[PDB]
Amino acid sequence: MVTFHTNHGDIVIKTFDDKAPETVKNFLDYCREGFYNNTIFHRVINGFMIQGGGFEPGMKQKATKEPIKNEANNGLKNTRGTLAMARTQAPHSATAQFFINVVDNDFLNFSGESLQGWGYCVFAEVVDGMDVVDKIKGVATGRSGMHQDVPKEDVIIESVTVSE
Description:
Belongs to the cyclophilin-type PPIase family. The chain is 12% helix and 25% strand. By secondary structure, it is an alpha+beta fold. It starts with a strand and ends with a strand.
């Protein structure tokens, strides 16, 4: 389990270690080093989800390492209050980026080893903090010179805790 302490509120995530052991190990290995401490929610899109953990509050690109393969063939799905990993550029380039699904979005799921079909691996789910997820996407929006489709109000993960 992972707890995020954000400046908009506390959020709790349950990891799928039985469904995504390699994906979860790499996530926890970063949280264990504190690599998600002082990281931002760097995307918000109307009628779609929020992405986070990929940058610092100065739009500084972090030292992302150890790209993971896409474990989406575990048969898990993307709905309201679930988490999956984001890629760098290729489908097996998921280093250290994730998102929280604020809507039901079937098109992110697995089909059957067909490149136009299968999306991204659900490594985890939200357990608590849905009201904070709805705050982070609901406060206000306005795009910047370095990153577009961002909240205009500041959303940071101030600290992180791994729970068992």
